[PDB]
Amino acid sequence: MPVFHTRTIESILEPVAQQISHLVIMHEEGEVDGKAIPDLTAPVSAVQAAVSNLVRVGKETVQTTEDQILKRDMPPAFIKVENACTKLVRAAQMLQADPYSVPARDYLIDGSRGILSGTSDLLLTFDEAEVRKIIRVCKGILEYLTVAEVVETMEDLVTYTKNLGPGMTKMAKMIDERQQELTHQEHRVMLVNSMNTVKELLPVLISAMKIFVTTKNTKSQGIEEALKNRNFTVEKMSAEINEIIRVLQLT
Amino acid sequence: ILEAAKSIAAATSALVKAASA
């Protein structure tokens, strides 16, 4: 009912959601009563085999992930899909005995929706875990910006810069590809804008830090001024990174 | 789960195609 929130999810489930709607258009909403559905044992046994596989691949993920939220949230989706499968199977049987069975049609619709819905939940949960990984990179840059305060040597500054360079570059790549995958254009705009702002402030931060280190070890002058520009750049960067974290979590 | 989910989608769409054949 909502737009699938990534392009991958949309290309997987969008075909299925449409087919389900076409099935409903007939049969249910009071319309094509008394039609006659053929034997569905074949196509249901194939869904059943795909359900098995999905649950296989999923239970390997669960016992293998570090993500504790993932570990908890996947199992319910497995239940929803197996339970929806169980109706599809009862529908195959019911239609074998009566091609005109109306409970068989209701089960078939409910079942199909349950497969869609449970597979949607399984993919969302998985996606959420991928997003938390990007948020891990973001919070580590945030933590590290907190430590710009304690840099006072040129040697400190160059270590700070060596360790910050990879973090920023990994983040930039992650947000770039994430943004591409999104299906809400306004969410891409925010991530690109916030990111572009962080990127452009990075060299300003380093220049601000050079300035503060240099004014400090020339042993006096406008140190209070150099201090509040470095601080502003860190508050402004941390603000954007936080905005990035918030917007990544939208769906 | 991407290949697992593609396969369940392909299987379900095909089921749902055979229920209007």
Tell me, what DSSP letter sits at residue A82? H
Query: How far apart, in whole angstroms, are the C-alpha atoms of residue A12 and residue B11?
Result: 12
Resolution in A: 2.1
Amino acid occupying residue A131 = V
Chain B contact set for A47 (CB, 8 A): 8, 11-12, 15
Q: Is B18 helix (H, G, I), strand (E, B) or coil?
A: helix
Cβ–Cβ gap A122/B21 under 8 Å = no
Query: How far apart, in whole angstroms, are the C-alpha atoms of residue B11 and residue A13?
Result: 12
The size of chain A, in residues, is 251
| Crossing angle of the two packed helices A223-248 and A102-145, in degrees rounded to 10 | 170
> How far apart are the CA of A17 and the nearest CA of chain B, in angstroms?
8
Query: How far apart, in whole angstroms, are the C-alpha atoms of residue A186 and residue A236?
Result: 21
Name which of A89, A86, A108, A90 is nearest A37 in CA terms: A108
- Per 3-state DSSP, chain A is made up of helix, strand and coil in percentages (nearest 5) of 80, 0, 15
Amino acid occupying residue A157 = L
Q: Are A137 and B15 in contact (CB under 8 A)?
A: no
Query: How far apart, in whole angstroms, are the C-alpha atoms of residue A56 and residue A53?
Result: 5
Query: How far apart, in whole angstroms, are the C-alpha atoms of residue A94 and residue A90?
Result: 6
A105: closest chain B residue by CA: B19
Tell me, what DSSP letter sits at residue A182? B
- Write the CB contacts of B17 (distance below 8 Å, at least 6 apart in sequence): A19
**Which whole-number Å values give the CA distances from A170 to A8, A177, A201, A237, in the listed order?**
22, 11, 16, 16
Chain B contact set for A46 (CB, 8 A): 11, 14-15
Name which of A67, A178, A61, A46 is nearest A115 in CA terms: A46
Radius of gyration of chain B (CA): 9
Q: Are A58 and B1 in contact (CB under 8 A)?
A: yes
Name which of A86, A73, A93 is nearest A112 in CA terms: A86
Domains of chain A and any CATH numbers: 1-129 (1.20.120.230), 130-251 (1.20.120.230)
Q: Is A6 helix (H, G, I), strand (E, B) or coil?
A: strand
According to DSSP, the residues that pair with A182 across neighbouring strands are: A6
**Which whole-number Å values give the CA distances from A46 to A41, A53, A106, A156, in the listed order?**
9, 11, 20, 62
Query: How far apart, in whole angstroms, are the C-alpha atoms of residue A34 and residue A39?
Result: 16
Cβ–Cβ gap A40/B7 under 8 Å = no
